[PDB]
Amino acid sequence: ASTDYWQNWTDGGGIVNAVNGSGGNYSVNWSNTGNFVVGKGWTTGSPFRTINYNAGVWAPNGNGYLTLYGWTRSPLIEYYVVDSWGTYRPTGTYKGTVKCDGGTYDIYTTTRYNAPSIDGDRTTFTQYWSVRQSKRPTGSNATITFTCHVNAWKSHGMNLGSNWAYQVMATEGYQSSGSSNVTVW
């Protein structure tokens, strides 16, 4: 499918060279950054979406996530389906596991306090995570069946909000350097 949303947010730290490529392709070269999130996807997320991507380059030199990323409002929730990472595997309060698209994912919840949200300014909000137990190999055509994650999250009392915001296949980094090149459809 054609992506219609370009996400390019940085807290201003370091260098984040994000390139909005043709179609669903984007690339990012980053160095000594604060926190940033770059990715392509859809303006309005859906619990029924099947996301396809191929990360031709996944080269983080530190803390970075290759992840499906999105938000819902009412309530405010930042969610993640992490397929690969750099030096740090994100974790939180363990809820259980789910097998989706050939991989096994741990389900976690965490809370952010006085942190920047989608609306701007800062607030306290919950984060939902599905984190692969081992890094998914990159360079191949991968699929993330979001319904598989949404249903598993629901079984653990992790219900998404009623107002859907953007949904993208992103590269997120935190105080690190690296490069990525991803195509989304």
Residue 115 is part of a domain; what is its CATH number?
A: 2.60.120.180
Residue whose C-alpha is closest to residue 175's, from 2, 4, 12: 12
The residue annotated as part of the active site, out of 78, 83, 101, 106, is 78
Q: Rounded to whole angstroms, what are the CA distances from 28 to 96, 167, 183?
A: 33, 18, 12
**Do 61 and 37 form a contact (C-beta atoms < 8 A)?**
no
Residues 6+ apart with CB under 8 A from 119: 73, 76
Q: Is the dihedral of CA 148, 154, 155, 157 positive or negative?
A: positive
Dihedral in degrees, nearest 10, Cα atoms 84, 125, 112, 174: 40
Supply the Cα-derived Rg of the chain in whole angstroms: 15
Find, among 78, 68, 76, 79, the residue nearest to 161 by Cα: 76
Which among 63, 143, 147, 160 has a CA at the least distance from the CA of 109?
160
Catalytic residue among 172, 178, 180, 183: 172
- Method of determination is X-ray
Concerning whether 158 is annotated as a catalytic residue, the answer is no
Q: Where are the alpha helices (DSSP H) in the chain?
A: 146-155
Question: What resolution in angstroms does the PDB record give?
Answer: 1.6
Query: Count of domains in the chain?
Result: 1
Q: Is 172 a catalytic residue?
A: yes
Range of the domain at 43: 1-185
Tokens coding 111: 């809370």
